[PDB]
Amino acid sequence: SNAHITLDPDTANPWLILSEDRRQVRLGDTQQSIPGNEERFDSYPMVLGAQHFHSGKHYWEVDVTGKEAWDLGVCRDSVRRKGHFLLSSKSGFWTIWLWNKQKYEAGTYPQTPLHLQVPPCQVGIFLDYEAGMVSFYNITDHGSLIYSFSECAFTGPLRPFFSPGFNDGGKNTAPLTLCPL
Ligand SMILES: CCOc1cc(Cl)ccc1-n1c(CN2CCNCC2)nc2ccc(F)cc2c1=O
């Protein structure tokens, strides 16, 4: 089931610029000044979707065209927001990412290298709560499976997870965009 995802402003790390529609996010040129509510990611440029999922099946698409790094997927709502962590299946995160413009990996511990034929301009996330799966699909390549976590022992609600980059050092100015449908 198609989910209409929007970004939660309360989770967004200071370094992030959300669109006004809540459907787009880019890494910014310096921190912004906002509060330090407990829901906000202090240590890395991450933000959640507003939707919580307690059950059922949910699909959404993210445009990543041009970007040299990024991280997508799903996480426990109960993940710590304050401080340092890895994006690991062991630690409440079901993610894939592009690092360094060339290296796709999936957030196993330790992570798993992905060899993609067609580099994705667009990525699908499919959450099946009851199955205990999070699946990533390469839309550019007609929906080929990028990677799938299974036997995820979902307890409590989950959130869509996003990060458009780690350091604006490069030109990671382009946004993650949530696609219509
Ligand atoms: C590929 C780069 O990975 C990282 C880079 C930095 Cl600067 C900080 C943390 C990580 N990272 C991370 C988090 N980063 C992943 C890549 N995108 C940025 C966040 N997750 C991991 C999960 C499992 C594992 F075995 C290792 C890692 C890991 O090293």
Curated annotation (Swiss-Prot):
Inducers of expression: Up-regulated by isoform 2 of XBP1. Up-regulated by IFNG/interferon-gamma, with a peak after 2-4 hours of treatment in monocytes/macrophages.
Protein known as: E3 ubiquitin-protein ligase TRIM21
Annotated ranges, domain B30.2/SPRY: 4-181
Encoding gene, per UniProt annotation: TRIM21
Subunit structure: Homotrimer. Interacts (via C-terminus) with IRF8 (via C-terminus). Component of a SCF(SKP2)-like complex containing CUL1, SKP1, TRIM21 and SKP2. Interacts with CALR, CUL1, FBXW11, HSPA5, IKBKB, IRF3, SKP1 and VCP. Interacts with SKP2; the interaction with SKP2 does not depend on an intact F-box domain. Interacts (via N-terminus and C-terminus) with DCP2 (via N-terminus and C-terminus). Interacts with ULK1, BECN1 and with ATG8 family members, including GABARAP, GABARAPL1, GABARAPL2 and MAP1LC3C/LC3C. Interacts with TRIM21 and SQSTM1/sequestosome 1. Interacts with IRF3. (Microbial infection) Interacts (via B30.2/SPRY domain) with severe fever with thrombocytopenia syndrome virus (SFTSV) NSs; this interaction activates NFE2L2-mediated transcriptional activation of antioxidant genes.
Modified how: Autoubiquitinated; does not lead to its proteasomal degradation. Deubiquitinated by USP4; leading to its stabilization.
Protein source organism: Homo sapiens (Human)
Family: Belongs to the TRIM/RBCC family.
Domain comment quoted from the record: The coiled-coil is necessary for the cytoplasmic localization. The RING-type zinc finger is necessary for ubiquitination and for the IRF3-driven interferon beta promoter activity. Interacts with SKP2 and CUL1 in a RING finger-independent manner. The RING-type zinc finger is necessary for ubiquitination of NMI.
Localization (cell): Cytoplasm; Cytoplasmic vesicle, Autophagosome; Nucleus; Cytoplasm, P-body
